[PDB]
């Protein structure tokens, strides 16, 4: 049998089950892992050290996002791909390499280009969730995942007081970049999603995976209630020299006298969370918010 899946560029048809399949999507590799699936193919420095998939020497490696090999997925032969976000640059040519694999674009819009990017990240993940599980018969488990994301959602949204002010910020090489409201990687939707109300404004917000470059004294003059930060280095399996983002923002002299550090409100993300920004993730990352914001 078949299904018709539709994605932001059309309606393809995708055999359920299918084999060899090709994963690239960054938000969806834990999903497929844990609901067991087969994978052919995977671009393994991107992903978590600790995934299944990275370890399993019978799934072939694409590389990474910079310097890919995109001509194993014609090799393997697939008969699905799955794009998402660190290799969505490369969908039309994943077309022309294999076009008689079903290509799917998991990938939505969380760029300074989306208007409505808080609802395209928990719509969006939803949807990746829902469309893997008709392709993989996996209808019961993708249902019960998105109902744990919807009350996540209601519980973090519930503990906010609507007048903390949050500062989000991205730590990489040991410096403490912006992750702006809106467009800002990791936190930026969830301004959205939850009201936050952002701590700091600055002019040319972006969504730089390593934050917007920002001053700790500027971060500090704006005296978040909350520092929410993200390590970017801690997910990356080829970073060895790293510096954990605990450690960077424990001896930042600048910002030991906001209120955030006053008060222990600071928020790490997962380790993970950089190279996994998934359900499974936020599922952990919006418990321990919701802890500690009530
Ligand atoms: O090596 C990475 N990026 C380099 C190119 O931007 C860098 O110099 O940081 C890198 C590795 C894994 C995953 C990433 O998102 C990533 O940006
Ligand atoms: O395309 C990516 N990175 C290249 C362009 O900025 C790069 O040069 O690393 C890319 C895409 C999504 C998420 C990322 O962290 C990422 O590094
Ligand atoms: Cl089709
Ligand atoms: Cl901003
Ligand atoms: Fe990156």
Redesign the pocket.
Known sequence: STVEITDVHGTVTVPVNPKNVVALDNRTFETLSDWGIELAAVPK??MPADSPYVKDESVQDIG???EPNLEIIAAVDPELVIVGQ?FARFYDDIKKLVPNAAVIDLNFDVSTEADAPGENLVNGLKDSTIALGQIFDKNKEAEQLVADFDQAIAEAKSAYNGTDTVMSVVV?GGNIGFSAPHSGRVWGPMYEIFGWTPALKIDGASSD??GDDVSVEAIAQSNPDWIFVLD?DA?????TDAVPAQDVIDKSPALQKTTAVSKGQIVYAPKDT??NESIQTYLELFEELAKALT
């Open positions: 420095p991107v990474s996002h910079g660190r990489s995976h390593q970017r997910a990356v399996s080829s970073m950089y190279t």
